[PDB]
Paper text:
Pyruvate dehydrogenase (PDH) is a multienzyme complex that catalyzes the oxidative transformation of pyruvate to acetyl coenzyme A (CoA), CO2, and reducing equivalents in the form of NADH. The first step involves decarboxylation of pyruvate, which proceeds through formation of a covalent intermediate with the thiamine diphosphate cofactor (ThDP) in the active site of the pyruvate decarboxylase subunit (E1p; EC 1.2.4.2). E1p also catalyzes the second reaction step in which the acetyl group is transferred regiospecifically onto one of the sulfur atoms of a lipoyl moiety. The E1p enzyme from pyruvate dehydrogenase is a prototypical thiamine-dependent decarboxylase subunit from the extensive family of 2-oxo acid dehydrogenases.
We have also solved the structure of the E1p/E2p-PSBD complex with bound 2-(1-hydroxyethyl)-3-deazaThDP at 2.5 Å resolution, representing an analog of the postdecarboxylation enamine-ThDP intermediate. We prepared cocrystals of G. stearothermophilus E1p/E2p-PSBD in complex with 2-(1-hydroxyethyl)-3-deazaThDP (he-3-deazaThDP), an analog of the enamine-ThDP intermediate. The ligand he-3-deazaThDP mimics the postdecarboxylation enamine-ThDP intermediate in both structure and charge state, but with a distorted geometry. The true enamine intermediate is sp2 hybridized at C2α, but the C2α atom of our analog is sp3 hybridized. Although a racemic mixture was used in the crystallizations, the electron density map suggests that the R enantiomer was preferred in the crystal. The H128β Nɛ atom contributes to a hydrogen-bonding network involving the OA atom of he-3-deazaThDP (distance of 3.4 Å) and the cofactor's N4′ (distance 2.5 Å). We observe that the inner and outer loops are also both ordered in the he-3-deazaThDP complex structure in all four subunits of the asymmetric unit. In the crystal structure of the he-3-deazaThDP, the pocket has few apparent fixed water molecules. Our docking model suggests that by simply flipping about the Cβ-Cγ bond, the H271α Nɛ is brought away from the thiazole and orientated toward the dithiolane ring of the oxidised lipoyl group. In one of the four asymmetric unit copies of the he-deazaThDP complex, the H271α appears to have made this flip, and this is correlated with the loss of the water molecule that links the side chain to the terminal phosphate of the ThDP.
Author numbering:
A (entry chain B), D (entry chain D): 1 to 324
B (entry chain A), E (entry chain C): 4 to 368
C (entry chain I): 128 to 165
């Protein structure tokens, strides 16, 4: 049952196509080609073109097509080739589908899931690796899910697809097939808006999501060699945040840092930090610091190494908080 | 030096978009060969609705000035392109209206009192009754076009023999979503009717500054779908264009773009300085003689189908129905933060669950 | 000129103690209890 | 002379059109009509259709236009009728002009200023009052400014038009004509990125921007009747933040709250709480609380009154912080 | 029931868009009237550049599979559509290229070692030399079209007798930006030339599923501007089309849309695309014979203006230069995070000043 994250993704899509006749998969090059990273491979040939198809090149169009289909009872699962391209579909996502239930007082709803890869570390061209989770996180009516392991990916996508409200599912490029993990075959779900402890610690709480989780765990092993026991928490849903799990952990360690790949003035670290300060203020022993990238535009491929935060920056920031 | 036939090219496309008309400004039939098939009782019903809709506009303006209605966009002068177009649809057809297309959804099933709540800004006004196939008016110009291609592709997939119809204005044809919408409908060969109401102005911008194209109907060419330009003050013509477009769609032949040439007798909206924004008034009198009610009136009287006694009846009926709808809008209870939160999701996420208890209490005493 | 954060601040105010009098062994936290005792 | 905010904006545009032949004003109905709220009244008649003109109805095109113009040496001052329509132009603003200097290693730059009204409390139809400055605040390479007074409005616009990098000038709909204020005739500038103290206080710091400054001042006058001295600081630039002024003020009072009109999950309040916490947490006597609207879509017109944060909300929260 | 002449509309309209051709497959002149005024020396320079661009394409692919280069979009097969179009321009003209149009900006003045830096992902690759009017390749499909209308409007306001030229693909014609651009350009009557390179594919998707329009050139009718379809494998026809467009534009007559019918013999991009999964192998041999280098070579050899001796001299000069560009890109100093901060703004705001200090220390160890 060893699978890479892209395989768990495909398997979760295969399952939902079987159980729910209303599910449809579409976007640019997702039919006969199977996608840029082969996420939808083999699906069209098994479920038919009437359920898995290519569309004209136009994100704004794909988003407007998804809303309409939902009004006719279908459960759409469109794809934006890269999340850097979400600026073209901003109105359909935030000005439309996220507000349909509220706008119609519950008469209509959008059982829609938007799949899209992001993240850096594999040297892609301009606007492909951007981290824009913070934009959609500010629109009420949406749920933003970001998995970090093959196991979390399959179960979250199924819950996402089953959700009767819009959900944005971001898949990190560097985690697609970089590692393997045990994934049970068959349907199973993981609640949306629920975080999980990836490593139990006692000295400090390290909160992260996406590819930063790996770096955090990487950093936790090094720190163990120095007597500092770190607790690593993976959010897995960046909106809503699992306040109880976050707080529960901080009111035990009394210290913490938040880790993200995005620019400091971007991302979601600011909201987690704000929330911690308002609820666990009486348990803190040190200020809650963030580990983020510089406030410049996402770097030209060649400069990813020196720009992207890695486990060494998490080692350093963790020591600052401990030596406070 | 070599010269490309660019001048001839623009002339040949123009020849392909002549203005379609059945009734001239006098009520005379100038196109027998295309006269639609309508019984005596359907023509009377088409007139009653147009007169009724004209009365609605006058009261809506009055009520808005009295502060009894909120946002409102005048429809007077556009009854043919609005009412006669909706008259060609069936109960199962889906309507995706614009901010100015409130009449259409009223006739398709949306209770009149709920249209006043929409104006005032009340969620109950948007809660469309089940089975009535419509969306609340769309404010973002162009969004309703890409959305209709979706509803349409949907009907095609369920096998249902219905159509998705949507409306936009001349200014709207400039938006990229307008283009993506009709092109997407064409690529999928979906049953969609796209209507563009050309009343010559986008707020204060004349259509001649919107594009250097001579007809808005020729824009259908970039999508590869049939385009038709019709007289927007001609009831029978707009009825025939949509009907032909309906048949074509339900037979799986694809979408059609319809440009109507109408005009507005009142302000852009009633929101700000709009009621006092510059109006030509030399241009108003001219289009005043072209009034849809005027010519259709003479068309029916010549056939002994309309008396000045039925007109008064419909006018008193619309005035009374309007008075009780505005009354019923007053009786609907005020809204609370809890009502607006309960309709954000099916299952409330933690942040809203917590926020629900805070406003619950701040409500009860 | 008084460094303590932040529950130390609320804990001293709840016990009727002025944080300025105490000598923070480490900006207090458990040495406020030592103040109340002596 | 005594001026309203809309009059201060008008005079600043005139000062700039006259001092620099490269400046151009354009957008939907900004010409002969003079704009929806008369902001550009009389400019086209004075400077000609070559400097002040109208365009087809398409936000995306207005944004692209501004980019090309600036590649040709001009200094564009484009206009979006209402900021709720920015979704339509997100790519040009954030995916293009804010990255051009960076993308060309300095070779080209974008001396552009976008003007746009926003804000609630005036009963407008859907998507006209939303507060989305949180979105633009997340893109490196932009500066977002939001005046609250006529004086600040004139000085900032002039400063925004002269800057050689992209600036978004948000003008609150409710503040356009709510009060007059003495405003010096002629040119003068207010630095971008500098907050200022509206009311001096010693017991609690109230941080606000836009139309919330007024509400905060009304709460401050109420808090005074009970002996509570509140200091009201107006940000006036939400990106970048004037850290030095904010932190310097909170360290003096020890207590602070942040106020925004935008929903809790949006706005820039979280960023403010985060910077405060990591720089002066050792001075905080209580947690920095937030006053914000429910995390729902912007309300239907009739419920604005019970949904938008007013001075009473500010008072209740301010007390909560004093009695923590 | 009454019927509208829809089928005749779609036919007549596309009749106005026949393929413009000068040189056929065997290199014979089939259109003497439109023959351009080019000297024997200009003809040899057009060939030298096409042979050179083909060699650059083969060398790029090779250096990419060696890791020497990064992102790369093959251009083999589109030499005429790209090089002969550029030949019709002058130094003052402004080019807004897309990701595959790196050849055009090279010939327009960008040092070849900088193109390779653009591929690797280094900011110095994008620092265009002053006086060379180009933008770095645009990655977001559509964006260069709405930016071209601005540039064009800019050149017009200053009174310059120059044009803005921009390129995109068949898939790019479906974007909302594609339509707003040529529509804005038309409404303002600005000197912009919009070139569409129809290589029959958008990554793996065939153009037949993008739209139902008979041709892509007809999409200009939506904006009301003239459009021309030409043989993209015909260098003498691309040059003439762009020549007539440039002249019309500098004479203040507006923009023009040019659709070239070409083909790409190579992968969509060098990332991992494999053509055998979506297009016939026998379909790659149908366009193999329509190679622009082959026909132009025969045309010249028929006038005694080309020998294999001159061709190998160009092949040599090409390899030699490619080799030098590659060594120059390697000698370029590595990129630093302080270098990325310094080019963000003219005057650094507070948050970047802090970070600048923070990263200035981390870079000194
Ligand atoms: C994307 C976008 N931009 C701007 C507006 C503001 C706006 C209106 C408000 C209502 O949002 S009404 C209107 C003019 C529409 O002109 P038209 O297309 O000719 O239609 P008509 O003449 O029937 O109004 C605009 C620009 C909008 N609604 N949506
Ligand atoms: C808005 C948007 N969507 C998707 C992409 C991804 C993408 C490319 C990468 C580069 O981002 S190349 C390409 C296909 C373009 O096909 P075309 O227009 O026919 O051009 P050509 O055949 O010359 O490649 C897409 C969809 C993009 N760049 N921009
Ligand atoms: K969903
Ligand atoms: K500026
Ligand atoms: Mg109009
Ligand atoms: Mg768009
Ligand atoms: Mg192509």
């Amino acid at each position: 049952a060893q699978m890479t994250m892209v395989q768990a993704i495909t398997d979760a899509l295969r399952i939902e196509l079987k159980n729910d006749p209303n599910v449809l998969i579409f976007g640019e090059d997702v039919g006969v080609n199977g996608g840029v990273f082969r996420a939808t491979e083999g699906l069209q040939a098994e479920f038919g073109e009437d359920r898995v198809f290519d569309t004209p090149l136009a994100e704004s169009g794909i988003g407007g097509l998804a809303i309409g289909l939902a009004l006719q009872g279908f459960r759409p699962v469109p794809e934006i080739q890269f999340f850097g391209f979400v600026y073209e579909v901003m109105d359909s996502i935030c000005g439309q589908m996220a507000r349909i239930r509220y706008r119609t007082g519950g008469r209509y709803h959008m059982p829609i899931t938007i799949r899209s890869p992001f993240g850096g570390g594999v040297h892609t061209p301009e606007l492909h690796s951007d981290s824009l989770e913070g934009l959609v996180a500010q629109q009420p009516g949406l749920k933003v899910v970001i998995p970090s392991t093959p196991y979390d990916a399959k179960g979250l996508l199924i819950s996402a697809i089953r959700d009767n409200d819009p959900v944005i599912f971001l898949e990190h490029l560097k985690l697609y097939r970089s590692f393997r993990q045990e994934v049970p075959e068959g349907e199973y779900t993981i609640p949306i808006g629920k975080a999980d402890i990836k490593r139990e610690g006692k000295d400090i709480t390290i909160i992260a999501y996406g590819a930063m989780v790996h770096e955090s765990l990487k950093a936790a092993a090094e720190l163990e060699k120095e007597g500092i026991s770190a607790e690593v928490v993976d959010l897995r849903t960046v909106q809503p945040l699992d306040i109880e799990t976050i707080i529960g952990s901080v009111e035990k360690t009394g210290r913490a840092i938040v880790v993200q790949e995005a620019q400091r003035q971007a991302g979601i670290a600011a909201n987690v930090v704000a929330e911690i300060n308002e609820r666990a203020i009486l348990s803190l022993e040190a200020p809650v610091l963030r580990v983020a990238a510089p406030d410049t535009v996402y770097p030209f491929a060649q400069a990813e190494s020196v720009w992207l935060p890695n486990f060494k920056d998490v080692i350093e920031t963790a020591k600052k908080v401990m030596n406070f | 030096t070599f010269q490309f036939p660019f001048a001839e090219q623009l002339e040949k496309v123009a020849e392909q978009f002549p203005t379609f008309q059945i009734l001239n400004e006098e009520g005379e039939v100038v196109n027998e060969e295309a006269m639609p098939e309508l019984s005596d009782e359907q023509l009377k019903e088409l007139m009653r609705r147009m007169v009724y809709t004209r009365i609605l506009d006058q009261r809506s303006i009055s009520l808005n000035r009295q502060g009894r209605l909120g946002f409102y966009a005048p429809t007077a002068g556009q009854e043919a392109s609005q009412i006669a177009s909706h008259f060609a649809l069936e109960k199962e057809d889906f309507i995706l209206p614009g901010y100015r297309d409130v009449p259409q959804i009223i006739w398709h099933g949306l209770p009149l009192y709920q249209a006043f709540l929409f104006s005032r800004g009340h969620f109950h006004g948007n809660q469309i009754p089940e089975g009535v196939n419509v969306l609340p008016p769309q404010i973002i110009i162009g969004a309703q076009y890409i959305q209709a291609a979706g509803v349409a592709l949907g009907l095609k997939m369920r096998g249902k023999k219905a159509v998705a119809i949507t409306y936009t204005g001349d200014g709207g044809t400039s938006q990229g979503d307008f283009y993506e919408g009709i092109n997407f409908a064409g690529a999928f060969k979906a049953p969609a009717i796209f209507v563009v109401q050309n009343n010559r102005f986008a707020i204060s911008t004349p259509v001649e500054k919107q594009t250097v194209a001579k007809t808005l109907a020729q824009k259908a060419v970039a999508a590869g779908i049939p385009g038709i330009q019709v007289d927007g003050m001609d009831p029978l013509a707009v009825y025939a264009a949509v009907k032909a477009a309906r048949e074509r769609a339900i037979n799986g032949e694809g979408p059609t773009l319809i440009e109507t040439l109408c005009f507005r007798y009142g302000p852009h909206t009633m929101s700000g300085d709009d009621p006092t924004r510059y109006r030509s008034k030399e241009l108003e009198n001219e289009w005043a003689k072209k009034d849809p009610l005027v010519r259709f009136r003479k068309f029916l009287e010549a056939k002994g189908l309309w008396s000045e006694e039925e007109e008064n009846n419909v006018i008193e009926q619309a005035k009374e129905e309007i008075k009780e709808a505005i009354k019923k809008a007053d009786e609907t209870p005020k809204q609370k933060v809890t009502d607006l939160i309960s309709i954000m999701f099916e299952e409330l996420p933690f942040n809203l669950k917590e926020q629900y208890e805070i406003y619950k209490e701040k409500e009860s005493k | 000129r008084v460094i303590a954060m932040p529950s130390v601040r609320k804990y001293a105010r709840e016990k009727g103690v002025d944080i300025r009098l105490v000598q923070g062994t480490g900006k207090n936290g458990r040495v406020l209890k030592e103040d109340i005792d002596a």
